[PDB]
Amino acid sequence: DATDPAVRAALQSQPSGLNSTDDWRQVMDRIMSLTARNPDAFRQQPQANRLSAILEAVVPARANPTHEKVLAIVNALAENRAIRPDEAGLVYDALLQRVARYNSGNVQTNLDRLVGDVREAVAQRERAQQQGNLGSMVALNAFLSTQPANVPRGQEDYTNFVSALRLMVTETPQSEVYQSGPDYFFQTSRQGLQTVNLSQAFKNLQGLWGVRSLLTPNSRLLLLLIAPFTDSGSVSRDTYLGHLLTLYREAIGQAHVDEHTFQEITSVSRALGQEDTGSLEATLNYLL
């Protein structure tokens, strides 16, 4: 609701109190004293405050939804990055001017259809961010059209590797693939390091799938990122690519338990009393 463009439009246009137009039932429960908490809080008002609320209740005042319907649209354009936040007042007066030149019963109905349409489109984008798959599956499958589907040797290792390659981009919503000129790439996160080169890695691994000092370090970076998404039976045991994928799974598991060992040794080296400079260097040389 904090990211809802019509809840945010109600927090910027609608009053923060109980008027007798937007909240007719909640103020008639208070005029007629049938409220659970403090029923007699309306009898204790002056006639200027008490009779002016009765008149707005038995014959309520009409209002314009047009500034509220447009502000729900502007606050969804500013949320789906269609406009800048600095342009939020520029396009608000630009849209209010257009629905004033062309105001009709059709347009006010069409703004009522479009404020339900932008509630969906804000939520559809925020679902697509947390899923994180649609921008990557169409560009990884576009990569794999370029790569051949039949290697000469080790096709069993190759078709499970590229199936685990689809498992990184699916089971990590921040990861993405794209193109920049000839080659394609893979970032493990938005605005993060460890960017592998897919067109350079698969022109390096091609010719190494059945071999059983020769690897480019981005191919080894690819074999490090693909390692937690690869089973022991996904690739072979004797194959040099399969021998490394088991070796990189042990390196991740050792770096996962040297992380917990680091948090234990440095915790009991401060309380026991050591140099804080040398507690942090002798621990790494014990763990690396």
Binding site: L90, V91, D93, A94, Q97
Partner: protein, 50 residues
């Protein structure tokens, strides 16, 4: 050897042309609809020019 004490007059002549001052934020031609003409676009704001 008997040259008189002289003073230098400098000027330019630039015929056939119009002194173009483009209404762009870096004085360049990046398009016919300049970037300072798009900030005033959909603004509905009248400005005096002196």
């Amino acid at each position: 050897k008997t040259a008189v004490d002289s003073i230098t007059q400098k000027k330019f002549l630039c015929d056939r042309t119009l002194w173009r001052i483009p209404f762009s934020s870096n004085f360049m031609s990046m398009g016919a609809l300049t970037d300072l003409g798009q900030n005033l676009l959909y603004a509905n704001s009248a400005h005096a020019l002196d």
